[PDB]
């Protein structure tokens, strides 16, 4: 991000916290208590079901 | 050129963000959308545009 005048070098982990998150932290999911994931399936219009 | 940026600077739609947003602090209790600059509404903003 910047190099300082006495040499230095500053890095984006000096300035931050990285990791691998999520891109929205709206919903959460919830099986019987315990963390969960999932799919929604929505059925087609006009397709069988079974 | 300098009156279109002016008006393109001056009347404009900004996203900000939220109070209390997600992922939150533990104790967050209050979430409150932030809202910022928008559009103008009348010919008497536009003239007082700087």
């Given at each position: 991000l910047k190099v300082n005048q006495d040499g230095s070098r500053v890095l984006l982990r000096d300035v931050a916290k990285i990791e691998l998150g999520g891109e929205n932290y709206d919903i959460i999911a919830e099986f019987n208590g315990q963390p969960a994931s999932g799919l929604g399936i929505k059925l087609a219009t006009g397709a069988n079901a079974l | 050129v300098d009156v279109i940026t002016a008006i393109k600077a001056q009347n404009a739609q900004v996203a900000a963000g939220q109070l209390?947003?997600?992922?939150?602090?533990?104790?967050?209790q209050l979430n409150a959308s932030i809202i910022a600059q928008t559009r103008l509404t009348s010919t008497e903003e536009f003239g007082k545009i700087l």
């Amino acid at each position: 991000l910047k190099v300082n005048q006495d040499g230095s070098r500053v890095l984006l982990r000096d300035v931050a916290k990285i990791e691998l998150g999520g891109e929205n932290y709206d919903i959460i999911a919830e099986f019987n208590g315990q963390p969960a994931s999932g799919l929604g399936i929505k059925l087609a219009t006009g397709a069988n079901a079974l | 050129v300098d009156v279109i940026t002016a008006i393109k600077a001056q009347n404009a739609q900004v996203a900000a963000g939220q109070l209390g947003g997600t992922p939150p602090v533990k104790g967050q209790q209050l979430n409150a959308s932030i809202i910022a600059q928008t559009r103008l509404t009348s010919t008497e903003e536009f003239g007082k545009i700087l």
